[PDB]
UniProtKB/Swiss-Prot annotation:
Native source species: Dryopteris crassirhizoma
Protein's name in the database: Plastocyanin
Record's keyword annotation contains rRNA-binding: no
Keywords, in A-Z order: Chloroplast, Copper, Electron transport, Membrane, Metal-binding, Plastid, Thylakoid, Transport
Coiled coil regions in record: none
The family this protein is said to belong to: Belongs to the plastocyanin family.
Residue spans crossing the bilayer: none
Co-factor: note: The crystal structure with reduced Cu(1+) has also been determined.
Record localization: Plastid, Chloroplast thylakoid membrane
Domain Plastocyanin-like: 1-102
Any GO MF annotation of the entry: electron transfer activity
Lineage: Eukaryota, Viridiplantae, Streptophyta, Embryophyta, Tracheophyta
GO cellular component annotations of the record: chloroplast thylakoid membrane
Name of the encoding gene: PETE
Summary of the function given for this chain in its UniProt record: Participates in electron transfer between P700 and the cytochrome b6-f complex in photosystem I.
Length: 102
C-alpha cells in the first residue's frame, strides 16, 4: 500500500487517511510537498506486548521527519486489526489516519 504524507499546498493530511492492507503488506509513506511530516502509530493501552512491539517498529521516532532528503518510510504490521497513526508535529492539527490489516 502507498500513503501520501502531506501535499504541495501545505495541508496537514495523509492521502488517503484510511487504508486496508493484507497482513505483512508494507505501507510505504512518502512525503509530498515541502512541509516535513512523520508517521507514528498510537499504541493502545490494552494491546498485547507483541502488538505494541510491532507498532513501535512501524513508527518513526518523534525526532525524525520525512524530508526531500529522506522522502519515505515503510511500515509492516502483521496483526489483523485497525490501528490509528498520526504526524508528531501536526498531531493537534488532526493529521491522522487509520490502517486496517486483514
Ligand atoms: Cu505533519
Amino acid at each position: 500500500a502507498k500513503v501520501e504524507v502531506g501535499d504541495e499546498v501545505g495541508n496537514f493530511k495523509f492521502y488517503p487517511d484510511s487504508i486496508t492492507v493484507s497482513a505483512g503488506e508494507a505501507v510505504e509513506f512518502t512525503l509530498v510537498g515541502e512541509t516535513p511530516h512523520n508517521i507514528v502509530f498510537d499504541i493502545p493501552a490494552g494491546a498485547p506486548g507483541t502488538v505494541a512491539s510491532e507498532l513501535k517498529a512501524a513508527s518513526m521516532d518523534e525526532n525524525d521527519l520525512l524530508s526531500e532528503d529522506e522522502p519515505s518510510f515503510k511500515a509492516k504490521v502483521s496483526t489483523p486489526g485497525t490501528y490509528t497513526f498520526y504526524c508528531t508535529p501536526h498531531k493537534s492539527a488532526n493529521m491522522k489516519g487509520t490502517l486496517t490489516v486483514k
